[PDB]
Amino acid sequence: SGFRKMAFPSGKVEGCMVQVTCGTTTLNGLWLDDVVYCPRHVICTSEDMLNPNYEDLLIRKSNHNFLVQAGNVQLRVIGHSMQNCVLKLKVDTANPKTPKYKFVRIQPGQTFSVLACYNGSPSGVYQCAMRPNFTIKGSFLNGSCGSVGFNIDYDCVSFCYMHHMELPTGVHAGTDLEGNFYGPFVDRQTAQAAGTDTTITVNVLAWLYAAVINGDRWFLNRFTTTLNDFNLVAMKYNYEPLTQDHVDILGPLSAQTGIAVLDMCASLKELLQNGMNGRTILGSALLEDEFTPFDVVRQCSGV
């Protein structure tokens, strides 16, 4: 038993990380088959970054302006192209470590593993949820751009995130691997703010089920509630409304524990209205919303 925030094993992605240098700018790229993907702002200079015109900037580049390094081996760039906010550099070598992969775009409320990288070299792995306001709460320093986020399903890597920037609140923004930003953000050095966020209700309930599966039961009660009466409370506390599809997604956890979803919603209502009174749930004094129902089932089915 036990419940821990857990990343996917990162080996398959570590074999894809390279270093991309253009001018005095160095960041990370993703080498799949004979293409390297990286943030297009690698071609910017300090002054270009206030309001660059990337079509102009790229036209003024040629293949020899891009230095790609896969460990010690330098890869020869034989083509370059822009796809939205990502640059695609064709190289003279197919990555022999290319896994089965897909490019997928994730929804707010879903999770993925981030492999933080610097100078083409992986440094650490951790889990993130895409917030309702299309930001993630990550850990990224200068040089981390081009680090990617991903999920793994039966040795197929679904890439969903490439890192591009940090907002003033300390949260992080980036694109899918088609180079389309998550959220209303742009890759230039101007004042940008995340919209207001909300709490992911279905994830909180999933984590409450994880708590019960692991022996935390103090917050349970005999009451049930209706979907409508719960959603009235949710709106008050800046929680997303619960839909019948969310109840259905929680079905398997409801079955394993014998606690109906609307039974657990009564617990959440009382937790929202009364707090915890000094107690904790799975070691947290706060209600956690960064675990999906799938994340919970992944750790808890064997208990």
Next chain:
Amino acid sequence: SGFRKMAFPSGKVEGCMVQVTCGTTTLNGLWLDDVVYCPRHVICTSEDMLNPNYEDLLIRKSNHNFLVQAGNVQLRVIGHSMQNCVLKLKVDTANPKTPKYKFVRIQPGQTFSVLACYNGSPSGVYQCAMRPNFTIKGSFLNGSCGSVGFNIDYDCVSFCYMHHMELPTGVHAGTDLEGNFYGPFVDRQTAQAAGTDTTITVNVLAWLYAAVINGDRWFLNRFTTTLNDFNLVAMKYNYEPLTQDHVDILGPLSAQTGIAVLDMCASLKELLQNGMNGRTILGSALLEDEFTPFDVVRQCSGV
């Protein structure tokens, strides 16, 4: 910026995980050069596990009783031996993916990455601290034994933990890679309890410095305290005493922030005596003690 609990990239260890089966028992092993390491209780049966005599049990085994699988390739066992609570199986093939490695034993208060595995296949990665009572707070189901814990330093993997069992409180116990248990535990199915735990004071202060580096400053104050007067408060709240070596270890973080250690100790004293009054620190409503000073420096020096 940003501060996240972060595992080491797990690729180098994923290339070492195999599956070890004996009788109806299957768990994980660690394949380095031509030796596979696994928990010795793989040789037990359901009834052996109450109070096994492992020397007897091993003498009654031979090489052909052990089935080792590295993916689809079956490895031939050519020798077996016991080293304390781990079994060493010599196989006919050196692992071509063997990294530079060491076997190290860690101290309470230190952290490491756990690569959770099932049937020889990695499933997820996360960070653990060795508690003062020699347990870890992990996530392990049936079949996870032989999963290992490790740190990485300049492409050298220091292995420090192999998983063996779960205690009744839901916490986890195991050995170093020499097969010597952390703590006063034994590998048999009897009633065993962890001693009382304490909070790792130097880690809490390290996390407070991480908070300041990331812009959380509300808990700071103008006061300083003495080491003796702090340790009087620490004893009251079940915190470990702070030593001059702990102040020294925190030196670099103290320098980066311009906040002396005994200056931060005054903050911690007030937090212990007054709580947070509804506020959070790096997104936590509780004081966190699972980050070492090294873990913090690793993420925060570039800020």
